[PDB]
């Protein structure tokens, strides 16, 4: 009893993002991908914005380069996989209010 | 913060009141300070005095 | 989210303002602005116990052997 | 009832008390306080209570 692999989809397309516990975001928030092509391996950004917020997410280089994440889509009844790899991203959301400060001094 | 420090751990009454306590107390004292880089302006203008680092920053 | 008696902002994760003392039948958050009192209430409760220890005595000792 | 509402009657915070009148083997009464009562550690003060409360 071993599940078969079917296919496997080695180029950046789906990504695997780290958030607050309730993130939810608009019916449309949109999700921007970046691809730093850094020697052997790409280190990855997200970036977004909302109405009121703005959300950033990184990789963690130092675990990334040492560890890899795979993401795939099976089927029980096609016994298949379509196989995705996946940047993990470890984001932060700052909004509007987060970017107001007082002066440099008392 | 809450995620960081009980994570799965959601059961324990015990560790979910007294954090309750901590995070809604912080908000209660400094309702201010909003933001990370406030926070930072609290505490080097807060200790501007004594880390001898002057207008210099 | 709501968790335990703490209720967190959904959009932005910001433990807002506690529904039971709100001066609006709606509060919001204090970094984004959600509605909360007024959306779904909560029913706020917890089952908080003693930790088995306040409460020493010759009959909890022939109740640990 | 009586013994209950007696007990309201002389203490301002407690509203119900239901007891074991069966074997004694626990004692219920319920405390209602107004939201601006925030918060408070309610375990830790019963169990400080419970050593300062002498048969
Ligand atoms: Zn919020």
Same mark, same amino acid.
């Given at each position: 009893?071993?599940?078969?692999?079917?296919?496997?989809?080695?180029?950046?397309?789906?990504?695997?993002?780290?958030?607050?516990?309730?993130?939810?975001?608009?019916?449309?928030?949109?999700?921007?991908?970046?691809?730093?092509?850094?020697?052997?391996?790409?280190?990855?950004?997200?970036?977004?914005?909302?109405?009121?917020?703005?959300?950033?997410?990184?990789?963690?280089?130092?675990?990334?380069?040492?560890?890899?994440?795979?993401?795939?889509?099976?089927?029980?009844?096609?016994?298949?996989?379509?196989?995705?790899?996946?940047?993990?991203?470890?984001?932060?959301?700052?909004?509007?209010?987060?970017?107001?400060?007082?002066?440099?001094?008392? | 913060?809450?995620?960081?420090?009980?994570?799965?751990?959601?059961?324990?009454?015990?560790?979910?009141?007294?954090?309750?306590?901590?995070?809604?107390?912080?908000?209660?004292?400094?309702?201010?300070?909003?933001?990370?880089?406030?926070?930072?302006?609290?505490?080097?203008?807060?200790?501007?005095?004594?880390?001898?680092?002057?207008?210099?920053? | 989210?709501?968790?335990?008696?703490?209720?967190?902002?959904?959009?932005?994760?910001?433990?807002?303002?506690?529904?039971?003392?709100?001066?609006?039948?709606?509060?919001?958050?204090?970094?984004?602005?959600?509605?909360?009192?007024?959306?779904?209430?909560?029913?706020?409760?917890?089952?908080?116990?003693?930790?088995?220890?306040?409460?020493?005595?010759?009959?909890?000792?022939?109740?640990?052997? | 009832?009586?013994?209950?509402?007696?007990?309201?009657?002389?203490?301002? %915070?407690?509203?119900?008390?239901?007891? =074991?009148? +069966?074997?004694?083997?626990?004692?219920? %009464?319920?405390?209602?306080?107004?939201? =601006?009562? +925030?918060?408070?550690?309610?375990?830790?003060?019963?169990?400080?209570?419970?050593?300062?409360?002498?048969?």
């Amino acid at each position: 009893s071993e599940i078969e692999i079917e296919s496997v989809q080695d180029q950046p397309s789906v990504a695997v993002g780290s958030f607050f516990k309730g993130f939810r975001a608009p019916s449309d928030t949109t999700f921007d991908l970046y691809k730093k092509k850094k020697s052997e391996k790409d280190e990855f950004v997200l970036h977004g914005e909302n109405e009121r917020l703005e959300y950033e997410g990184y990789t963690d280089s130092s675990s990334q380069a040492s560890n890899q994440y795979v993401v795939g889509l099976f089927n029980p009844e096609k016994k298949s996989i379509q196989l995705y790899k996946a940047p993990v991203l470890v984001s932060k959301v700052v909004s509007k209010s987060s970017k107001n400060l007082r002066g440099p001094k008392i | 913060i809450f995620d960081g420090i009980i994570g799965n751990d959601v059961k324990d009454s015990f560790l979910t009141d007294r954090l309750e306590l901590l995070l809604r107390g912080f908000k209660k004292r400094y309702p201010h300070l909003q933001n990370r880089t406030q926070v930072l302006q609290y505490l080097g203008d807060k200790f501007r005095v004594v880390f001898q680092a002057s207008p210099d920053q | 989210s709501v968790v335990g008696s703490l209720i967190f902002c959904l959009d932005c994760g910001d433990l807002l303002e506690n529904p039971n003392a709100v001066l609006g039948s709606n509060v919001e958050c204090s970094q984004c602005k959600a509605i909360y009192p007024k959306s779904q209430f909560s029913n706020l409760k917890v089952v908080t116990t003693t930790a088995d220890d306040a409460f020493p005595s010759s009959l909890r000792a022939k109740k640990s052997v | 009832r009586d013994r209950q509402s007696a007990i309201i009657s002389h203490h301002r %915070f407690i509203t119900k008390y239901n007891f =074991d009148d +069966e074997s004694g083997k626990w004692c219920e %009464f319920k405390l209602e306080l107004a939201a =601006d009562t +925030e918060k408070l550690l309610m375990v830790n003060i019963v169990e400080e209570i419970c050593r300062k409360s002498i048969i």
